Structure formats: structure tokens, C-alpha cells
Enzyme design. Structure first.
Site, PDB file in Angstrom:
ATOM      1  N   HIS A   1       0.810  -1.214   0.000  1.00 13.41           N
ATOM      2  CA  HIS A   1       0.000   0.000   0.000  1.00 13.41           C
ATOM      3  C   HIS A   1       0.851   1.275   0.000  1.00 13.41           C
ATOM      4  O   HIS A   1       0.296   2.359  -0.208  1.00 13.41           O
ATOM      5  CB  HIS A   1      -0.948   0.044   1.191  1.00 13.41           C
ATOM      6  CG  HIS A   1      -1.975  -1.038   1.199  1.00 13.41           C
ATOM      7  ND1 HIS A   1      -2.815  -1.273   0.136  1.00 13.41           N
ATOM      8  CD2 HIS A   1      -2.324  -1.919   2.160  1.00 13.41           C
ATOM      9  CE1 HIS A   1      -3.627  -2.274   0.441  1.00 13.41           C
ATOM     10  NE2 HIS A   1      -3.348  -2.687   1.658  1.00 13.41           N
TER      11      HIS A   1
ATOM     12  N   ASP B   1      -2.318 -10.922  -1.758  1.00 12.28           N
ATOM     13  CA  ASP B   1      -2.944 -10.290  -0.596  1.00 12.28           C
ATOM     14  C   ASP B   1      -4.360  -9.948  -1.029  1.00 12.28           C
ATOM     15  O   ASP B   1      -4.581  -9.609  -2.198  1.00 12.28           O
ATOM     16  CB  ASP B   1      -2.121  -9.052  -0.197  1.00 12.28           C
ATOM     17  CG  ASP B   1      -2.600  -8.380   1.052  1.00 12.28           C
ATOM     18  OD1 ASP B   1      -3.634  -7.672   1.008  1.00 12.28           O
ATOM     19  OD2 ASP B   1      -1.919  -8.506   2.098  1.00 12.28           O
TER      20      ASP B   1
ATOM     21  N   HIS C   1      -6.101  -7.436  -0.441  1.00 17.07           N
ATOM     22  CA  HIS C   1      -6.232  -6.009  -0.807  1.00 17.07           C
ATOM     23  C   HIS C   1      -5.425  -5.643  -2.050  1.00 17.07           C
ATOM     24  O   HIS C   1      -4.352  -6.207  -2.328  1.00 17.07           O
ATOM     25  CB  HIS C   1      -5.804  -5.117   0.353  1.00 17.07           C
ATOM     26  CG  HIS C   1      -6.499  -5.428   1.641  1.00 17.07           C
ATOM     27  ND1 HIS C   1      -5.948  -6.255   2.608  1.00 17.07           N
ATOM     28  CD2 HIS C   1      -7.709  -5.050   2.113  1.00 17.07           C
ATOM     29  CE1 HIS C   1      -6.792  -6.355   3.618  1.00 17.07           C
ATOM     30  NE2 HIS C   1      -7.874  -5.649   3.338  1.00 17.07           N
TER      31      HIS C   1
ATOM     32  N   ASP D   1      -4.298 -12.732   3.897  1.00 15.10           N
ATOM     33  CA  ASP D   1      -5.576 -12.225   4.401  1.00 15.10           C
ATOM     34  C   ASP D   1      -6.780 -12.652   3.539  1.00 15.10           C
ATOM     35  O   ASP D   1      -7.908 -12.414   3.940  1.00 15.10           O
ATOM     36  CB  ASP D   1      -5.547 -10.710   4.695  1.00 15.10           C
ATOM     37  CG  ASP D   1      -4.857  -9.898   3.620  1.00 15.10           C
ATOM     38  OD1 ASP D   1      -4.482 -10.429   2.556  1.00 15.10           O
ATOM     39  OD2 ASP D   1      -4.670  -8.696   3.875  1.00 15.10           O
TER      40      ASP D   1
ATOM     41  N   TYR E   1      -3.927 -11.740   9.013  1.00 16.28           N
ATOM     42  CA  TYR E   1      -4.105 -11.369  10.422  1.00 16.28           C
ATOM     43  C   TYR E   1      -4.575 -12.474  11.350  1.00 16.28           C
ATOM     44  O   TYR E   1      -4.574 -12.259  12.548  1.00 16.28           O
ATOM     45  CB  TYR E   1      -4.992 -10.118  10.526  1.00 16.28           C
ATOM     46  CG  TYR E   1      -4.453  -9.068   9.608  1.00 16.28           C
ATOM     47  CD1 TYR E   1      -3.266  -8.413   9.912  1.00 16.28           C
ATOM     48  CD2 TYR E   1      -5.027  -8.844   8.355  1.00 16.28           C
ATOM     49  CE1 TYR E   1      -2.713  -7.504   9.040  1.00 16.28           C
ATOM     50  CE2 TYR E   1      -4.481  -7.925   7.467  1.00 16.28           C
ATOM     51  CZ  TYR E   1      -3.322  -7.266   7.822  1.00 16.28           C
ATOM     52  OH  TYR E   1      -2.753  -6.362   6.970  1.00 16.28           O
TER      53      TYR E   1
END
Ligand SMILES: [K+]
Ligand SMILES: [K+]
Ligand SMILES: [Zn+2]
Length: 357
Positions: free
Chosen positions: A133, A171, A173, A264, A304
Site C-alpha cells: 500500500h 494479498d 487487498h 488475508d 491477520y
């Protein structure tokens, strides 16, 4: 063939002093490392040392303004750390954060160097904080510097400028930062699979949609695979790899593969809402090992659920070590929207990749 592993417990020092239960926990990396010890994978790897990235290396992808501000956080008091962190989208900062981000990046540089010199065939990097990110000029989404992007540029710096690097980002995201860093570049192919939900899922930008294919000479070299309306899992990811990731990757013919390996999307993640299994991640890893003469570096991003990420990343390492892929559960028909997503990407990328025709 030797597999490299980098882990340094100093990367645990980055912490959230106001919310000690924040999900980007220090123990994310110690748990993954511990699971490698438990399964007797650690002794089968060659241990690669961590190092600090240099400011010059950070400048491969980041502005001096950004580097300077994060650097300054090392000597701030708690109130100023809280204030600075709150200026960004989803960031906490402690006095150790800068050093930890440097260690994450330098760990990956050493790993890429080991791969590119032939000292190891492939490698895993158990690092935090995450990277994907992070933008050229800002921190975001628990990320300070874009570890994977920096590693691609570092790799080019020790080989040749046009070394073809594939970044696969699994990931859950979108790696907004990675996309933007390489958006005009044809030397780095960026392929992201992510939960999108028509722009409603973090990082909440339509930049993650399938129609963003790259700019300028980078047209065709940014591949977004966005998922909408479905609890996606092994069937959808295996289909995406079969129809999109692998055909495009083979045509690109990378000389190095970097995996922005968030876990995740894993079954049990508290944020992702998906159900990719450890066996799923093993199959994705195994497929990527057929590229670039096996020159694959797996870099931890998000994920997580401590049990889920530990089992999932350990299974990837098992694949890099040459162990046989575990059996997937019977793959049910794809969620209807997943078929729609794959077809949309196929339409968007057919102009650039003859393997999709
Ligand atoms: K992704
Ligand atoms: K690109
Ligand atoms: Zn993530």
C-alpha cells in the site's frame, strides 16, 4: 536446489502503543517463523541475514520528502507519533517503525541478491511492516515503504535496468502503491488478485478495477483481477491462475518473480472474508515456480489470523523446498461473479497478450 529464508526478530519492535490488539501484530512474524520450526522447515532452508535498507535504496521508489518524514519518527515523543500516524490512511507509528521498515526492505534485497547470484534457487521473507500500500510519496494501510517495489528496482540495479520482474500480489487487498509505482513501466509486470466490491473494499479506489491496464509504455503490464459479491476461495483463485495469471506470466517471461504474499484471503482471516486454504496457497506457489527458472521470492504482506498465516506461509515454503503439492478439496463450480470478473479481465487484456486470445 537451496531455499533461502530471512527472518529477524527486531522487526517485532514496530508496535501500536495506543491499541496493542491492533491486528498488524509483532507476533505475526514470530508465529510464522515458529511454525516453520515446528514443521522442521527452518533447518531445510539457508538462513539469509537481514540488513537495513539505505536511504539511497529507498530513493529507488520513494520521494526524499517521504523518506525524511518517516526517518524523523525515530526520535518523536508519543503525542507526535500519534499525530503523524493519524495524517495517513490506516497507519500507526512507534520509535522503532522506521528501522523495522528498513529491515523489511533490506531483508528482501539480500534475498533477491541470493536468488539472482544463484546462491539459492528461491526464498521466503518473513517480514513486517508490510509494503504494497506504500506510495512513492506516502504511507498507507500499515505500510511505510513498498518493499516489493523496492526489491524489483534493487534487482534491476544489480543485473540490468530492463530485467523482467513479475510481481504477483495475492494479498486480499489491492496493492495501490505497487500499481502506481510501476504504472508506466513495461519492465515490471504487476498482477493483483483482490477483493474489490465495486470499490467498497479497502483501499476503496476504482484504481483497483480490471480496466486499469497501465499507462504509456506500461499499457498491458498492469493486470487487476477484482472480486465482487462472493466468498472467494480455492476454486476462484485456481481458475484465475489458469485463465489469466499463468498465460500472461509465461508470455512476459519473467527473469524474477516476487510474490506480494498477503495471507488475508485465507480461511479464518478477521478482515478478508475469503476462504483460500493453505493447500490453495501451496498450489499457487507451485504454479509460480514454473516461471523464471524457479527464481521466486515470497514476501509477507498482510494476513491477520496468526494460525492461518502461519500454516499458509509454511506451506508455500514447503513448495519452494520441492515438496509435493497437497491435495485440494474437490473444486466446486465458480461463484457466478468470479466468472464475470475473469471474463472482464480477459476482455481488457486480450489486446495486449496473445495467449489470452
Ligand atoms: K492483491
Ligand atoms: K506495470
Ligand atoms: Zn491485505
Amino acid at each position: 536446489p537451496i531455499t533461502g529464508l530471512v527472518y529477524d526478530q527486531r522487526m517485532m519492535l514496530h508496535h501500536n502503543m495506543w491499541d496493542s490488539h491492533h491486528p498488524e501484530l509483532p507476533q505475526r512474524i514470530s508465529r510464522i517463523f515458529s511454525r516453520h520450526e515446528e514443521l522442521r522447515l527452518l533447518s531445510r532452508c539457508h538462513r539469509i541475514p537481514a540488513r537495513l535498507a539505505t536511504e539511497e535504496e529507498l530513493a529507488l521508489c520513494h520521494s526524499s520528502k517521504h523518506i525524511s518524514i518517516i526517518k524523523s519518527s525515530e526520535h518523536m515523543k508519543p503525542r507526535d507519533l500519534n499525530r503523524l500516524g493519524d495524517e495517513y490512511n490506516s497507519i500507526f507509528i512507534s520509535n522503532e517503525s522506521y528501522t523495522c521498515a528498513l529491515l523489511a526492505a533490506g531483508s528482501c534485497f539480500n534475498s533477491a541478491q541470493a536468488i539472482l547470484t544463484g546462491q539459492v534457487r528461491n526464498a521466503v521473507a518473513i517480514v513486517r511492516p508490510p509494503g504494497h500500500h506504500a506510495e512513492k510519496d506516502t504511507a498507507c494501510g500499515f505500510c511505510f515503504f513498498n518493499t516489493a517495489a523496492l526489491t524489483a528496482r534493487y534487482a534491476q540495479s544489480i543485473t540490468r535496468e530492463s530485467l523482467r520482474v513479475l510481481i504477483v500480489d495475492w494479498d486480499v487487498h489491492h496493492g495501490n502503491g505497487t500499481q502506481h509505482i510501476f504504472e508506466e513501466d513495461d519492465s515490471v509486470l504487476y498482477i493483483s488478485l483482490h477483493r474489490y466490491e465495486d470499490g467498497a473494499f479497502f483501499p476503496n479506489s476504482e484504481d483497483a478495477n480490471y480496466d486499469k491496464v497501465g499507462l504509456g509504455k506500461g499499457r498491458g503490464y498492469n493486470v487487476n483481477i477484482p472480486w465482487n459479491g462472493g466468498k472467494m476461495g480455492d476454486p476462484e483463485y485456481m481458475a484465475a491462475f489458469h485463465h489469466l495469471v499463468m498465460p500472461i506470466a509465461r508470455e512476459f517471461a519473467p527473469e524474477l518473480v516476487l510474490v506480494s504474499a498477503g495471507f488475508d484471503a485465507a480461511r479464518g482471516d478477521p478482515l478478508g472474508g475469503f476462504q483460500v486454504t493453505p493447500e490453495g496457497y501451496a498450489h499457487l506457489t507451485h504454479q509460480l515456480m514454473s516461471l523464471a527458472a524457479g527464481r521466486v521470492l515470497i514476501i509477507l504482506e498482510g494476513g491477520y489470523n496468526l494460525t492461518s498465516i502461519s500454516e499458509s506461509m509454511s506451506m508455500c515454503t514447503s513448495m519452494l523446498l520441492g515438496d509435493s503439492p497437497p491435495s485440494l478439496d474437490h473444486l466446486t463450480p465458480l461463484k457466478t461473479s468470479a466468472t464475470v470478473s475473469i471474463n472482464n479481465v480477459l476482455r481488457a487484456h486480450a489486446p495486449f497478450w496473445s495467449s489470452l486470445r
